[PDB]
Structure 1
């Protein structure tokens, strides 16, 4: 089971790369009480994949 959950874990690491950006934008918006359809997505993805 312990070497199986290790497969589950890296599948989840693959998946979460997509949710994290949505989380970042939602947090930023609730913090600043405003919507921002940010332009320079470059910075978003540069973090979206580097440390993940």
Structure 2
């Protein structure tokens, strides 16, 4: 059983990582869409056209 406990620890750690991982980006999307403006838009477009 010393291995079947370890498998359960690894698996729980993985599921926890998964939830935090999806929350990170799901939140980042809301932060972006809430905090953009045409200066921020211009900076990005003008940076990327300069490597076009």
TM-score range, shorter chain: 0.3 to 0.5
* Structure 1: distance between partners of 2:51 and 2:17: 10
Q: Which runs of 5+ in 2 are unaligned?
A: none
Secondary structure at 2:34's aligned position in 1? coil
Q: Which runs of 5+ in 1 are unaligned?
A: none
Larger radius of gyration: 2
* Structure 2: distance between partners of 1:48 and 1:35: 20
Aligned residue pairs: how many? 52
Q: TM-score, normalised by structure 2?
A: 0.37
The alpha-carbon deviation at position 22 of structure 1 amounts to 0.5
Deviations 1:14-49 (A, max 9, x none): 421111110000110000018999999999999999
**CA-atom RMSD, angstroms?**
11.2
Which has the larger share of helix?
2
Secondary structure at 1:23's aligned position in 2? helix
Structure 1 residues 39 and 17: alpha-carbon distance in aligned structure 2, compared to 1, 3 A threshold: farther
